[PDB]
Design a protein around this ligand. Structure first.
Ligand code: MG
Ligand code: MG
Ligand code: MG
Ligand code: MG
Ligand code: OH
Ligand code: OH
Ligand code: OH
Ligand code: OH
Lengths: 386, 386, 386, 386
């Protein structure tokens, strides 16, 4: 059928299948997973690799020998399975010291600690072979207006990303940063709340080339945005450094459902885009198996993430390969969208009477776009009705 | 009391108090307003100026002599009142020829016409003294996935903004462009849907300095975003070229309520930001008097736009001037947010044991932020309870 | 593939395929359709019937003799095709006299007119064979707080529906009323905004049995609610008199996409529910072909409505018939949910030590619900990957 | 300024000021509070009473004698302060045995336990003097479609509330039940998601009169609904048994901000309604002090709750008492909305030519409703600019 192999580049965070089920209104429904057991179970499922936050791999406050021992046994599981670590990140949101943020905390001593905690994990991530380092600022934001001056907070966020870029340049590390946007939760509003705000921010950093975005399906959907459209803008800007896949069923709390769940047609158009644009990075799943599930349901949800990408990849590829669909695209003039509007230049456009004075606006206005026929061919292919 | 004068820089679009009340489910409840009568009534109210779309001033399809006559009588009303025209824009969304967009229409001949219609109105706007030219692409987008290839559509949008920049540079015009973001409506999803996506886009134009954003209160609120936060990012980037003020009561269709209505606390924090950042541009109202109203209610709604800005400007200025509030800000460490995190540099931060190895995380974690006290002082000032 | 037959009970309103394309920001993209041509084209497509608002069949303001002729043509087209008229409604939202509503307008004379316009259309619907009469109070509500006292307006809404009940009872008509809820648009907030609010209101009417709901897929999704769950509560209450099918992509303006589009997994769970509950009323499509389409695009979108109901009907029937799904439902204890909690009363429950004193809370807490495996089987059936 | 007195009937749950700060992405920022210290601090602040979940007063799993002592301390603090206990509820959401719900769990033995845990707390609430018993089915629902048959789960929900009704009737207790709706979180979709759905459900119970609603400001705003409108329908139905006050800034996770924050104009219209309808139950605050605050920040936020109710009470009373507002209501025909539409029946309506044949539709269509002038007077009163 649709069996994942390492060649598909599917990756999972330690915190995803390892989530215990504690939420805002309830306690853990599952026991803690050992990182070593997660590496082996995921390898058996056909995953290509794993990612971590520092505190997922090493308990907060571990002494250096406890730290040594956690990394050592993690690395032996990696080597024994052939599993890779493509990405890593810092937890700057769980501990109560981060209750007003990490990099933009109002307290200056807490911003220095957040930067020291992050550099320590950049060194370890590079050792394990990570090529992308993610920054998700879940606690950077506010619930009230005078609590955070946002222009000065953006000065502190730029200062912190510029310091991290100076550090990896001076160490000569081959590692890139990717910002993960989220509109809200756990703060009332988070800074750089969508893909577009993170892309604009990057352009003001001292070394913009070192930074890109790591968008999450459900986060852009919490602001009611079109995730395929946000991803196309990121790819148009050359900034899609990584991507987090999951499901979300509308504007509400962050659900992190398994990929395919939530908005199924957006998942289809996202796979169509990634595959036709030739995205070559990891297909990473940041989801949380519902707390109704035991450990057998945890691996069934994680296996469903990979299966749904592969069914959808197949349906999108049959769609674009269908001659009838190719005909429908010409009918809807998707080939004329690819033509330059005025490669003849502005002066030639201004002198062209068929562009304005002799343009028949009502004949143009009457041409049907034939978009409903095209979308029902896309619907038939997704459902396997062709 | 709180009487507006031209010194307050309040401006209104011809289409706002001139809206007739036709919506998706209903016909006009009001007669058309003459542009000349709008200029005089707004001047009597204490407005500073007016803005227009080309088709508001000159009926679509007017011959050049009809065109001449409309502009001539408009300009005599302007001169007779001392009213200015700070901004102007193109209508690229009403006529059925724009049903798939203007600059990103799949049809190439329609993209050339959209660019010719826009250049014609740039010439007229500069004559009338407009310094900002707005582009609101309400029809650039899609209701379905294969209908619009978004990377090629962004190539057509960049091509069109680069052609407009070449044109005004070659004419030597002193005029800037400002992009107006909107998430959806009338398309299922619109391209560059928020302030952040428009700011990121600008950085890929050939002449980025010629372009900025013109955010609208209710549009960022349709994606559930914090409008004061979006505005602070625009000001941090030096890109707030203009601003459209109105009210919106949540994520639903675009209401364009009078400013102050909708989210009242966001309106207060927006005025606090504009006034403390020293924004010097027009305070423009793009709102629509509810269709329940007659022409007397139209001028009462428009007068309420200006009154609510002035009451709020006064409350925010009393807030920041209160010694008790200034004390509360120090208590919440808003002064330490202004201090550089590590001006001592990365190597000095890495050697600083108090930033990590000797940092007392639990003492830091226990410091209360005192943000609820600060926000209740902001609440008492807004309500005049102090 | 999958052809509609009259036995499928698919129906469409005159206003759906007849929408000309005007929206809040644009003029009509299509010509008006003649009702008799709509009846013919729909019968050729395999629909079973049509519905109408009085102003869709007879132009507002028609004399008794212009009325006569409109009605005569229409009934002639019906007779000729064998098309039925299952439901009808009144337009109490388009004309500007209804700008503050119809049954709950503040002006008493407007409330009286609204009731007289409605009774006139009830007599016509009854001779054409309609068994359901729909009420969509699209203008009942407000944009501001003191503009409507909602307790007194519910008094006027109750009085209106009680006067309609008295009237159909004294004429001995076999017609029933169905309320269509909608949360907002065109009013800032509409009265009876969801299925739940309409169901509760019905219980305070003089004759509750004459009244039920006509829920619409996209309206409950404009409040972010689960449409299948709302339908299940209406069926549990014995009040699903009719249903309106279409698609909506999230919380935003009322889109009226063709059925199947929008939230596709919710369309699958709705067809599964309607078919397993054996609902036997019409499957009515209230949608609007995108204004990007010409008339050929209209009939393609109207036929895609029916095709998507039929594909989903077949996928849901395959899901429920699969032995492995039936085993998965037993494993998630869907059979045990159907067993009464305490059929021997509360004194037998209070005496039972296994229900409290001796209940092993931690062993019960540790059972997995096996919900992700069941939902991935559901996912494989929808995509035809099973 | 504006001090709370016991006559104001302000109450708070033990869980509100006692929230320790754990959220989905972080650990507790504050220490647990002792109930007797909460009762004392709240009595000093001028509150009138406290509420509780059984697991807030007695730790889950306490023996009968640990129960004994918890209860004894608490009642001693109450006796000493004169604090009342107006309402109580059961925690059927925190413990992992409730991961698929309590009354509608798929497992029958879990449903039985849920009912036994609830009855145990009803006997205690009745001896402490509670006259309202709240049900918040936070775990009743699902993240996926086949995981819950909603018609059968409404059967189990009805059976549970009928068993509770039989029990309080056979004990002769004077307690009434109130259902708190919530649309989602922690479940993907919760059953009875809004005030309307809870009101309709009550009408199918064996003894409807024992049951009403306990609506919460932030929960109806998570569906984008108008909370004052929902409250008005509950008061119209005679079912507002209790209310929960707090703030929410839009559709997103349940924030539980202090009352006054969030949507401030909706808080103003809610106090105006509660005070003009003469609602006499408790004004209960169910909120969570932000986890950014220490314990001093907790009591500052709890006192800001009461202060904002009292300022708004005074602004609303001033709005309604102003002669000019009373003249503006007459001008918007708020008096005419209170007059019956057709008090002489439908045959007098049918005979009346002024209601249809001779009604001048265009002159009625042309009356302005004067709603913006009335809403700006409302705006001036809230801001104390009048
Ligand atoms: Mg997430
Ligand atoms: Mg707008
Ligand atoms: Mg609709
Ligand atoms: Mg809550
Ligand atoms: O996440
Ligand atoms: O707008
Ligand atoms: O609709
Ligand atoms: O809550």
């Amino acid at each position: 059928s649709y069996q994942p192999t390492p060649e598909d580049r599917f990756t999972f965070g330690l915190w995803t299948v390892g989530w215990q089920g504690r939420d805002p209104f309830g306690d853990a429904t599952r026991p803690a997973l050992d990182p070593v057991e997660t590496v082996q179970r995921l390898a058996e499922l056909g995953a290509h690799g794993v990612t971590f936050h520092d505190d997922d791999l090493i308990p907060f406050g571990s002494s250096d020998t406890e730290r040594e021992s956690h990394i050592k046994r993690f690395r032996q599981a990696l080597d024994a399975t052939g599993m890779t670590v493509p990405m890593a990140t810092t937890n700057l949101f769980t501990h109560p010291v981060f209750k007003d943020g990490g990099f933009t905390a109002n307290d200056r001593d807490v911003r220095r600690y957040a930067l020291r905690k992050t550099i320590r994990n950049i060194d370890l991530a590079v050792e394990l072979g990570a090529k992308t380092y993610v920054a998700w600022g879940g606690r950077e934001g506010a619930e009230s207006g005078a609590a955070k001056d946002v222009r000065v907070a953006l000065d502190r966020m730029k200062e912190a990303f510029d310091l991290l870029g100076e550090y990896v340049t001076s160490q000569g590390y081959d590692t890139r940063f990717a910002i993960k946007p989220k509109p809200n939760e756990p703060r009332g509003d988070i800074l750089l709340p969508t893909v577009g705000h993170a892309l604009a921010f990057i352009e003001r950093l001292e070394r913009p080339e070192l930074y890109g975005v790591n968008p999450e399906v459900g986060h852009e959907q919490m602001a009611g945005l079109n995730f395929p459209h946000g991803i196309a803008q990121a790819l148009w800007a050359g900034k899609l450094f990584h991507i987090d896949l999951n499901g979300q069923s509308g504007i509400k709390y962050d659900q992190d459902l398994r990929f395919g769940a939530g908005d199924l047609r957006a998942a289809f158009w996202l796979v169509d885009l990634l595959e036709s644009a030739g995205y070559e990075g990891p297909r990473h799943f940041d989801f949380k198996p519902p707390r109704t599930e035991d450990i057998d349901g945890v691996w069934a949800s994680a296996a469903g993430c990979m299966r749904n990408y592969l069914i959808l990849k197949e349906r999108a590829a049959a769609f674009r390969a269908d001659p009838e669909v190719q005909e429908a695209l010409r009918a809807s003039r998707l080939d004329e969208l690819a033509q330059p509007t005025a490669a003849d230049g502005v002066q030639e456009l201004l002198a062209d009477r068929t562009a304005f004075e002799d343009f028949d606006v009502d004949a143009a206005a009457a041409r049907g776009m034939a978009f409903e026929r095209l979308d029902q061919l896309a619907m038939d292919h997704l459902l396997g009705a062709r």
